[model samples]
Each structure stands twice: as structure tokens, then as C-alpha cells.
Target chain A: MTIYVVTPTYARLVQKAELVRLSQTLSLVPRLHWLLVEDAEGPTPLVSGLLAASGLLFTHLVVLTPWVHPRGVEQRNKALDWLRGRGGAVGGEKDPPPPGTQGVVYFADDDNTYSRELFEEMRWTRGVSVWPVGLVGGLRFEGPQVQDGRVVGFHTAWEPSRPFPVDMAGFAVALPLLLDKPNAQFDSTAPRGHLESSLLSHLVDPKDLEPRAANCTRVLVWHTRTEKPKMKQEEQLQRQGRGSDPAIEV
Target chain B: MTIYVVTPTYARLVQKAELVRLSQTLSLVPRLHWLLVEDAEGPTPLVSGLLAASGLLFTHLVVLTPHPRGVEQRNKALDWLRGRGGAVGGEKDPPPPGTQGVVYFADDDNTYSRELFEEMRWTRGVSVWPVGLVGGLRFEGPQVQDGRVVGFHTAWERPFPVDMAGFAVALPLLLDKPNAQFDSTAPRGHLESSLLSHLVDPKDLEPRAANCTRVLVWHTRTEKPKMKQEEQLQRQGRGSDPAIEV
Candidate 1:
């Protein structure tokens, strides 16, 4: 089965740098399809050239929101819409498999630090597979409660009562879930931190959880942030009509 | 010429992860030797396995830090570069096939433009360039004049005050000045000054990256990963997986 990894990103100073690093990581993995959704007016040559040079099979997508917003609500939904459109029905709740729907759907942000094992283990996602994500909930990691060799509940501190309280980086969905459950979009109306849980509540069951990453005993992903530096020098230089770095794509 | 990149790393939640990213970047460079030094009593199986799996020309060395900011671990790499041979940690592979190249101090956290390696590889003496997001300024490095580095256009005024990412010293120069290593005892932000003062004067600084006008590297640091969940599990005798190394 193909691994359909969806990443939503926008233009920033470190944009190409982060994408370059992540593309290198993804290239090392096999049978993976990248559905890179951009928060732009349309496709730009910078991203087009990046994915082309990465040597991977990919689909370029774009959506310009009033604001792209944090947690990537609409940008992620745009990818689901693409998959739903591809899987034979933008119309109904269930549709038969189409030309390119036999895969696992994972929402991967560009900035997270991922181990190769993280991608490798989730390849065989039988159902909603879950794992450990480092640096969530402002703590080390928050993930599933795997007990006696099976996933029991969400082992989370912040609001464990809210539907299925897991993180965006914590789980992967079988393509069937997204294909069959047409309503499984990341609900924009959902409260903050509910992006993962809201969509999960729509498509997953409490009993059919698959614990991965060594039975949720290892952290295979980290919520690492690239610090946004103050670009005051650029502003000062722009007034003088000069550029600091050249127009090289990263 | 081969690029001998000295990286000082320690065992932590992010050790293997950071090395994996750095190794991937280094693997793309032609004829690069990674001198990865670890901070430990001895080299652990985890890092050893990681470097071996990286499939790059590398030498693994270890020291018990006895300190931080990688001053000592970096010196061990310098010692190895000068053929002093500081570690019993065996070389699983031979060096990248070159007697001479630039010695770069690449901290695991920073972002390096791939072009930066090629720019520094042909250094005749010492090469200097601009580093982004450093010294509480937008960028800082040598001020170039008539294709030569005159002095540092920097945020702070001190003795050769430049970020480690801003410079590279050629191996021949380092081999001749054996005592010109990073002073572990030097005050903060003065380590580069200590070593460069022993090697070259201001006028000898060879400016790269289009005569120091471009920013080929950034002083980007990865945030320290929080491990409260793991810590809580430890107190209760629960582990993600204790026996298996991350």
C-alpha cells in the first residue's frame, strides 16, 4: 500500500530550508506519495522545483484561506477533499476503492523531527494506528495508553475527557476510514487543540486502535519548532534597496 | 579535498535524532569526513550503531565531557585532525581520501546550506563568512575589502568575535599550530578568538560566500525536548522501553 503523507505549509524565511530537510527524510522512505498542500494564491516555482528535485511521486495542491490559521485547519481539509474526490465520491458517506485509494493517510507537518522507524512502522496501518509524540501538551510526550499489549485509552494530561484526545502527530488512519467516512474533515468549529480529536471522533472506534512504535513504548516523533528570528536587518537593508542573501531557493 | 566536520554530541532524547538529520545532510556532500565526538564515559552502542548505519566516511570519538558547550569534545576532534589520536573508539572506516581540507566546527543544531561546504573546501588559510540569526543581530561576520577580510562587522566588539558557524580553518594551518586549539577555559564567546589569534592576523582572513555578503549558514538551535511524560513514567517504574536505545 502507498503511504499518503499530507503536509500543509506556507512561505516564510525558513520555509525552503525546512522543506529541504524534510524532503531528504521522506526520500529515504519507499512507496510514499506526498500530497503537499500549500497556503498560497497558487503553486509557486520554489515549491514546484523542490518537490521535482526530491525524486518522489507527488501531487501539488493549493488553497488560499482568509488566513491559513494555526493547527492548519482548512489546509488539512483541502487534502481530505482531494482524497475524497479521488476515492470515487465527493458526494456520499461511503465509496468503493478507486485507482489510488489503497493506502494509509498520515498528516505530517513540515517542521516535526521524525525518525525513519516512525514512517516504517505506520506503513501497515490496519486501523487507526497510534504512537508516542515527543513535546506535546507542553511536556515531554502525550500518547495512547497501551496496556497488556493493546491500546486502551489516551494517556494524556490535558483534557483526556474530550472525545479522542490525541495529538496531530500521534496517529495514522487507514485509507478506508477517509474513503468510507466522508464527513471526517478537520472541523474548523472545534475548539483549540481539537483538530486531531474532532476528526478522529468521526472516523475511528474506541476498540479498533492499533498501537505502533514498539507498542507506544518509544517516541518516534518530536514537536520541535524552528525559532522565528527577528529580521530587522533585512528591513533596514530593504530601505537601501539591497538584498542580503541572493535569490537562491534556500 | 575532503571536509572534516567536527560535531560534539551527547546522549539525550534528541541525540540519535539529531545525528540522523546531520548525517543525512552530510551524506550528500562529496568527500566529507564526519568526526563525531560523544560525551560519555565510553562510546555507547546506540551512537556507534548510528554512525555505522549512516554510510558516510566517519570517525567516532568519546570523552566524559568533564564540561559543556562542547569545548572539550571539539578539541578531541582537533587532536584527531592533527593526528594526535585521542580516542580508543575504533574507526570502522578509513578517512575520506584527502590529506588536506577545511576543518569545520558544525554543532548538531545549526542549519547549513549545502553550498557552504563547497565554498569552504578550497580555503588556502582561514575562511570567514556571515552567519544568520546570531550575536543578537540579524547576522555577523568579517567586513570584506578589496576581496580581503579587513575586520569583523559584528554586534559585539571583542577579540576576533565571530560565531563558530562563521569560519573554517584549513587542516594544514591546524597541523602547524598544534597548540592553537579551542581553550575550554576561555570565557564565553571568546573560544573562536583564542584559536584564531594563534593562527592568523586580521588581514589574512579569506572571505567566502561572495566576499561575505551572503548568509550560507544560520545559527539555528533545536529546542531542548521536554521529557516530563518519560520522567513521570520513570518514577513509577514505567518506561516507553528501557532496554531499547532511541
Candidate 2:
């Protein structure tokens, strides 16, 4: 099945590096479509040029949110709305799967490191698949506890009160399930750490979640955050309001 | 054992990014030392400044070469380690605790993880692990059945088909087998196996990293950034201001 990876990105000093690393990993996978949603008035030359040179099957989109809040909520909702319009969730529980409408939906933040096996394991999800995410939640791994090929409980250290206590990269939902629940959309106004739970609770329950990668025993994806390098010249340029533009060079 | 990572790097568009990524992985291990050997006439401001700010125990050295070969620069580091006058390559049997050390040839451009170093810490004589995204294959690891390497799964053919980033050797091997240095004259494909065969026998190979099933490291070579704008700036005599390359 095709895996539709939705990534929310914004322009920053390390933007090009993150995109390059992410693109390399994505290029190795097959039958994958990248839905790159940018948080801007329109596509800038930096991101636009990068998406073109990435050489991957992709759709570039834009969503401008107010500058007060952190990014990616509205951008993610835009991708979900696009999917819903294409017979993804039009009828909700009333209609069956539409023709030529197939695949899995994964919210892939641009900064994380993904193993190729993660995509291979989540590609066959029938409803919703859960797996272990490494270097998250102040622990080595945070994921569902699987017994007999089924999700029994969660193994998260912090915020156990959340409905689906899992990292954003910890789960993948079937496209048909998203189509089945048309109202299941991420709430921009939801409190901190409620985005994943708010959307996942509507798509699949705890008892029916499909466990993947040998019952989530292995850490196929790492929540690796790349720290911006300490470049003396780059810092001076930023202070002089002459920050480097990667589009012109890279 | 203290693990000493010997990295041979040169100035490039993506040099900083590659170094940053490698430094972060190296910082996660215990009792690890970074030996960064730059392929330059002298230390550049960019690399020296990065090493100072990296917050890890490191030593910086420079070795200039006409051609880009990782062998001669790496040999410079082995020679320096041998100069410490420890039992590195002296005694025929295993050396004492003071001379017990491990050396890993970590390319700056490749991707590594903490678990890979953790596995490398326990290596005795020589340890070999699997490498992913190599030779256009999903993975190329030592095919192990009962905790022993029988064969490898790689498409590249050579005297040694194994990748250079796939193994680590004990410090004593370097001290003992000074003639086993990386031969710049050897074919590129045989560089890894040729040096390995000189230090270790096939029967004494220690298979690691999930019995050669897991792939903790990736041979992800960073693409060189397009330097068109930098070239233009250089023509205007404003090239001294080193901008950060991706």
C-alpha cells in the first residue's frame, strides 16, 4: 500500500539540512508520497527549490497561521482536509472504501530520524499500527505494550493521563480509518500534548490497535533532534541582518 | 575500554553538518575520545572552532595530501597512537590494562548511533557489525547463525567486499602489525579487507550488533552543496566570511 507521509515544515537556519537528511531517507522507500505543508504565506524559493531537487513524489502546500502560536497544527489540518476531500472521510461511517482511494497516513515531523523498516512495517496496517519511538518522553522508548500481537497498554513515563499517550511518530493510521471518521481532526486549540491523543482516539480504540514490527519490540524510529551548529561566522551574519540564504547557494 | 574514534575529514560544503552529526553520536558514549584528523595544510577556523565548541574530549591534527584518500591521514593517527609508547603493538599476547584501547575508523559523512558505539565498547580483538545503505543494498551484515560470521550479504566484489565503516579493531593490533597499515596503492574495494586480514584471522572475528542482524549505522554520504553564490562572493574578495554550508 502507498504510504502518505504528511510533514509540517518551516524555514529556519537548519531548514535545508533537515530537509536534505529527511529527503535522503524518504527517497529510499518505494510507493511513498510526501505531502509537504509549509507554514508561510506562499512557497519560498528556498523550500520550493528544495522540493524540486528532492526527486521524490511530493505535493507542496502552504498554510499561514498567526505568529503567536507554535507551527504545524494548521499545516497538519490542511493535509488532513486535503485527504478528506479525496473520498477520505466524506461519508464517515456511512460509506465503504472508494475506488482508487488507498494507503496509510503517517505524521512525519521533519526533524526526526526514521528507519527504512518503519515504513515497511507500517505499510500493511489494516486499521491503526502502533510501535516504539526511541529517545522520547524522557526515556529510551515510549510505545504500546504488545502481548500476543495486540496492544495491551502503554509504556509512557510522562502524561499518562493523555488518551493515546504516544509520540507523534509512534503510530500510523490506515487511510480507510481516517476516511471512516470524517470528524477526527487535530484541534489546534487542544492543550499541549493532546494532538496525537485527540486525533487517534477517534480513529482507533486501545483494544483494536494493530501492533507492528514484532509487536513493537524494536525501536524503528528515533526522535533525534539536531541542534543548530555553533558557527561563528553565521552568528555574526545573523546579527548584521545578512543571514545566509541557502536557496541561492544550496 | 576507552574507545578512540579516528576520523579523517576535509573541508567541504557539508563538512560542518557531517561533523556535528558525528560529534553528537560520539558524545553519548562513556570514556570515548575523538581524534579528528583534517586533510588540510593547517587547521581551518571553521573546524577548529567546531571542535572547541563540541563539548567532547578531542584531539585535532592536520595532514595534507594531494589526492583524497582516507588511508594516509588515518595512518598518521595510528602512528601517533603508537608513539604513546604503550603496549599497543608490542607484546604478542593481549596487552595490559594501561594499553587496552579500541580504535574505530568513523567516516565523518556517515550516520551513527549510540547503540553502535555501545556495541563497539565490548570488542576484544576485532569486531565487525552490519552497515545499512551500502553497496545499493538494504543492508550488508555478517551472516551469523550461531554467534559467528559465516558470510556477508553485499553486492560489491573484491578481495574484501566489506565496507570500511563496518568494523573496529583493538589498539594492540595496530601496534603489533605496523605493516598492516592502509595501503593507498591497493584497489579501493580491497582497502578494508586487506588491512583486516593482516590484523585478524577469520576464525577470530567477533560478530556483534545483534549477531549481525541489526543495522545501527548508515553509510549516508552527504551531498556537496552547490557553491555558486559562494563563488560569486569570492570573486568580489568577500570570501573570508565563511558562511555555514548545509
Candidate 1: regions farther than 4 A off: A42-56, A65-70, A86-100, A145-149, A230-250, B88-98, B141-147, B150-153, B158-161, B210-214, B226-246
lDDT of 1 by residue, B1-246 (tens): 888898899877667667777787787789888889988899889888888777888888988766337888999888777666775554634333336788899998777767789999989888888887776556776778899877775545466878888889988888877699888888777878878998998688889999887777877766676666667666776545455455
- Candidate 2 per-residue lDDT, tens place, A19-119, comes to 76676678768998888888888777877776777678777777877723544888888888777764222111223235357799999998776766689
TM-score for predicted model 2 compared with the true structure: 0.52
Candidate 1 chain B: worst-modelled 10 consecutive residues by lDDT: B89-98
Top of the candidates by lDDT:
1
Report the Cα lDDT for residue A239, model 2: 70
Candidate 1 i-RMS: 3.7
Residue B29 alpha-carbon offset, candidate 2, angstroms: 28
Query: True contacts preserved, each candidate?
Result: 0.26, 0.00
Tell me each candidate's i-RMS in Å.
3.7, 18.4
Q: What is the DockQ of candidate 2?
A: 0.03
